[PDB]
Symmetry: none
Amino acid sequence: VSVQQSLAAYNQRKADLVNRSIAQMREATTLANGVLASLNLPAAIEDVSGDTVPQSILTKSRSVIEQGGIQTVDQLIKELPELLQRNREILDESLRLLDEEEATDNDLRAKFKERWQRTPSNELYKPLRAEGTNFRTVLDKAVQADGQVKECYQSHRDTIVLLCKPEPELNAAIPSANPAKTMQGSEVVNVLKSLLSNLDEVKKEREGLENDLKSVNFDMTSKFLTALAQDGVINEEALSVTELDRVYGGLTTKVQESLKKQEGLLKNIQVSHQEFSKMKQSNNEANLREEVLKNLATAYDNFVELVANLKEGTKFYNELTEILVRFQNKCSDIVFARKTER
Amino acid sequence: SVQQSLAAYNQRKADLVNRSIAQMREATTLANGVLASLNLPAAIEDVSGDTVPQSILTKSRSVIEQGGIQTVDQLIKELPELLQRNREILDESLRLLDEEEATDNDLRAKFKERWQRTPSNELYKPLRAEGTNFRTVLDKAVQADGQVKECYQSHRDTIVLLCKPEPELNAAIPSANPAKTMQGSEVVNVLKSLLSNLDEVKKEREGLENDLKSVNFDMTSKFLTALAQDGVINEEALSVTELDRVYGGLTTKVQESLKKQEGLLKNIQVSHQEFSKMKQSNNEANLREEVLKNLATAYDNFVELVANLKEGTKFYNELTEILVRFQNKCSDIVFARKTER
C-alpha cells in the first residue's frame, strides 16, 4: 500500500466533494432564476407605467452591453472548436509516435527470429494508449457539450440581441399595456420585494462559499506520513474521510443550509405571487407585454450562463494543452529510450 | 453471468422511467382532448360573438412563430428521404456479403477439402441477423410514418387558418350573439378556477418528466458490487428496492398528479353542464362553437405533430451512424476474406 497512491486517492476525494458542492449550488441558482423568469419577477412588481422598461430589465440590459453583448459570445464560439482541434492534433501526434516505433519493432520481429527474448514495444506502450483513450474520451465529451451549448445559444440569440438594443429601441419593442393599478405600494408587493431581496442574498452568498471551498489548502501528506510512521500501515479511506469532514464539514454544512433557504423562499414566493396575480391585467396586450418581458429575463440568464460556460471551456482547453504537451514529451522520451538501448 | 444480470437491471429501470413518462403524456393528451370537446377555455373568453377569443389568438401566436405550416411541411417531406437513405446503406452492406459468399461457395465447388476456411454462410449468420433486425426497425418506422402523414393530411385544413393574421382568422369563425351576463357569474368563476388548477397540474408535469429523465445516480455500481460480494443473488427483488429508494418519491408525485387531474376534470364537466344552460341554443352558436373547438384541436395537433417529427427526424439521423458502422464492419470483413486468408 503506497503513499503516492494514497495521496492521489485523497486528492480525488477532495476534488470530487468540492466539485459536487459547486455543481449543487450552480444547479440550484439556475433553477431559482428559472422560477423567477417563469413568474415575471422581479419585472412585474417594478412595472408601474406599463409603457417603460422595468428597472431590473434595464440593469440587465446595461450589464449585457458592458460585456460586449452579442460580440462576446460570437467570438468565443468562433474560436472554441479551434482550441479543441489543436488539442486533438497533439494527441494524434502523440499516439502516432508510438505507432511508428511499434511498426518498426514488429517489422524487426518478423525479420529477426531471435527477437522473442526481448519484450515487444506493443507491451511497453499499454499504459500510454490507456491514457490516450482517456484523453479521446475527455475530448469527445467536450465536443458534445460544445454541441448543445451552440444549439441552446442559437435559439436564444435573437432575444439577447433585443436585450442589447439602445434603451429607446428596447422600450419600443416591449408592447405597452394597462398597468396593474393597485400594486403600487401594497402589502403583497412589499412582501415579494423583501422575499426577493433575501433570495438575492442566498444567490450572492453562494459565490463566497464557492471561493471558500476552492481555497481550503490543507497539508494531508504530513498526516498520511504520521499515521504510517506510527501504526506501520495506511488506512487511506478512514483517514481521508476524517480530515475531509474536519476541514470541509463547516462549508458543506452551509451549502445544505443555502440550498434549503432557497427551497422555502421559493415556496413563499409562489404563495405571494398567487395573491399578486389577483390584481394583474388579462387584456390581450397585457399578455403580449408579459411574454416579452419574460423572454428578456430568460435571455439575460442564458447570456450569463453561456458566458460562464464558454469561459470555463477556453480555460479548460488551454490548461488541457499544457497537459497533452507533457504526455507527448513522455511518449517521445519512452520511444527514444526504447529505440536507443538495444 | 454478469453481462446478463446488468442488462436486466437496466431494463427494469428503463421501464419504471419510461412508463412514468408515458402516463404523463397520455394524461395530458387526454385533458387537452376534453378541454377541446367542451370548447374551453374559449367559451369563457368569448363575450362578443364576433371576435377571436384571446386564448385561440394566443395559440395562433405560437403556431405562426413556430414557423407555421412550413415547418411541418419540410420535416414531413424529408423524413421519407431520411428513411430511403438508410435503406440504401443496409442494402449496400448486405450486397457486399452476398458478393463474397458467392465466390466462397464457388471455391468449395472447384476445390473441396482443399478449401478449408469457415464457410461464408456460417461466418455471416449473425450479420444477416443484424440486417434482418435493422429491416424490422425500418419497416416499423415507415408504417408509423404513413400513420402520421395520413392523420396530418386530414388535419392540415384547420391548422392552415390558425396561421393567418387576426383579421383574416376571425372572418372564418362565424358570429353568434354577445354573452352579456356570463363573465363574472359564479358558475363561470368556479370553472375559471378549476381550469387554473388544471393548468398548474399539467405544468408541474414538465418538472417531473425532467426530474424523472435526468436522475443521474450510479445504481449500476452498487449492483455490480453486490454481484462481486455474493454469487447468485435475487436481482429482481433487489431491483424493486433500489428503485423505490431512488424513484419512489417521484412515482408518488406522478400518481398524485393523475388523481388531481382525475378529480378536476370531474368537476369541470359538472361546471360545463351548468354553463351549457346560460349559453345559446342557437344554430348559429352551434356553428361558431364547432369551429372554436376544431381550432383548439388543431393547435393541440400541431404541437404533438411537431414533437413527433422532431423526434422521428432525430432518430433516423441517428440510425444512420449505426448503419454506417455496420456497413464499415461488413466492408472490413469482406476485405479480410479477400485479402488476408
